Amino acid sequence: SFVEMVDNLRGKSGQGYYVEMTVGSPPQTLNILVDTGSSNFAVGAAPHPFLHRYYQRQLSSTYRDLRKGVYVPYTQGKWEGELGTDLVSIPHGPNVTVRANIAAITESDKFFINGSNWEGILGLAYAEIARPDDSLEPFFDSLVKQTHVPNLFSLQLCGASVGGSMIIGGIDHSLYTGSLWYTPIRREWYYEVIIVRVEINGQDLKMDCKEYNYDKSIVDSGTTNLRLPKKVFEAAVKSIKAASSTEKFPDGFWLGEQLVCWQAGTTPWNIFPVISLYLMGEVTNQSFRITILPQQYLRPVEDVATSQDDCYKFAISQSSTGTVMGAVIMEGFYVVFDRARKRIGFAVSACHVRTAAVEGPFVTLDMEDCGYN
Ligand SMILES: CCCCNC(=O)[C@H](C)C[C@H](O)[C@H](Cc1ccccc1)NC(=O)[C@@H]1CCC[C@H](C(C)(C)NC(C)=O)C1
Numbered sequence: 001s002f003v004e005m006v007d008n009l010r011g012k013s014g015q016g017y018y019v020e021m022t023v024g025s026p027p028q029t030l031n032i033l034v035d036t037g038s039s040n041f042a043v044g045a046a047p048h049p050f051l052h053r054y055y056q057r058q059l060s061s062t063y064r065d066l067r068k069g070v071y072v073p074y075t076q077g078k079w080e081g082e083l084g085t086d087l088v089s090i091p092h093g094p095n096v097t098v099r100a101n102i103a104a105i106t107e108s109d110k111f112f113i114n115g116s117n118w119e120g121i122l123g124l125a126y127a128e129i130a131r132p133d134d135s136l137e138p139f140f141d142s143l144v145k146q147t148h149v150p151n152l153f154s155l156q157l158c159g160a161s162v163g164g165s166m167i168i169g170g171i172d173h174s175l176y177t178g179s180l181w182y183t184p185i186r187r188e189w190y191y192e193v194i195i196v197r198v199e200i201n202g203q204d205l206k207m208d209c210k211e212y213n214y215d216k217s218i219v220d221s222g223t224t225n226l227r228l229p230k231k232v233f234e235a236a237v238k239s240i241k242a243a244s245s246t247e248k249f250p251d252g253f254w255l256g257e258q259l260v261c262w263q264a265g266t267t268p269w270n271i272f273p274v275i276s277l278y279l280m281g282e283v284t285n286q287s288f289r290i291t292i293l294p295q296q297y298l299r300p301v302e303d304v305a306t307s308q309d310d311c312y313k314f315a316i317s318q319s320s321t322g323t324v325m326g327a328v329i330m331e332g333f334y335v336v337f338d339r340a341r342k343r344i345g346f347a348v349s350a351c352h353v354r355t356a357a358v359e360g361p362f363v364t365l366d367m368e369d370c371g372y373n
Pocket residue numbers: 014015016017033035036037038039072073074075076077110111112129130131220221222223224225
């Protein structure tokens with residue numbers, strides 16, 4: 001019954017999507033951010049200025065202390081805590097219960113966001129990148145092994161308050177339109193894929209495709225923006241600045257720091273070009289592309305003066321650790337993390353809240369060489 005999982009996600013724009021879960025006995029309810037960019041399941045287990053509530057191990061009879069510490073650093077933010085196991089369930093998900101590893105966060109820095117509504121994080125990636133090491137089985141692996149839930153999940157993240165769906169164990173045909181296109185997972189650690197071509201405003205970036213995946217390209221629901229390697233980021237911004245030459249924006253805008261407003265309903269979408277990302281396909285020399293609209297990479301933010309002007313932020317930033325296809329990229333699509341077949345599927349999302357596209361086939365030679373080594 002995937003229908004019961006539809007809309008099981010929510011959150012605030014730019015602060016991630018979270019799902020409700022329960023841990024321990026009796027069940028303790030908490031909101032957990034869905035992160036395909038990590039592999040650790042962790043929850044606040046101690047007081048914190050931004051935590052509405054937290055996991056109380058003492059109150060759980062099924063709690064088991066592993067007597068081992070843990071530290072996890074992200075692109076932004078970090079925490080440390082005590083490892084242990086307990087019973088976990090997902091109210092608006094599969095009707096099952098499993099014992100999984102849980103990191104009880106005792107201390108953190110720039111991790112919890114003031115007013116996010118979530119008190120934990122669910123790393124959905126592979127054990128390979130779990131801390132302290134790959135012997136700490138990730139939550140999804142425990143779920144699949146302890147239950148009959150198929151080895152895959154799908155995410156439908158809807159743009160701007162924000163909502164979405166995490167279908168655990170399968171694909172929900174009502175969450176997308178058109179056909180699903182699959183790209184191979186290059187290696188099972190992060191959900192790594194290979195970008196074989198990039199176009200902006202219909203113009204090819206004419207860069208060595210390896211630059212697009214330096215030093216890797218991952219799909220991360222836990223990162224809001226689209227992050228690009230330095231050299232690719234510079235070329236993208238240049239192309240995007242030109243296409244919107246009709247207008248001028250502060251340098252802070254192009255840094256994702258500042259924000260630009262406009263009269264409610266007067267946002268000049270026509271001046272902002274679409275971005276096409278071509279991904280390695282499933283048959284020889286075959287690829288496909290997903291198109292990202294400005295309505296995606298221009299994240300809407302709170303009005304400065306008063307509710308009357310639509311303000312936005314450039315949701316594209318620079319990266320020194322490879323390409324990151326974040327939420328703004330995932331918003332336009334229904335994304336299938338097909339672990340069982342080591343592939344990720346993309347299809348036009350059913351959530352309207354204009355539209356992005358997924359088209360193929362296209363031809364590209366030596367696709368594997370686009371991957372960085
Ligand atoms: C240990 C081996 C795995 C490490 N993996 C990572 O660091 C990945 C690449 C990034 C994480 O998904 C992280 C998860 C996170 C979510 C919310 C808050 C903090 C961390 N998000 C990031 O590091 C992003 C870095 C850019 C800014 C965003 C922001 C703070 C704005 N939060 C969201 C949800 O976008 C977070």
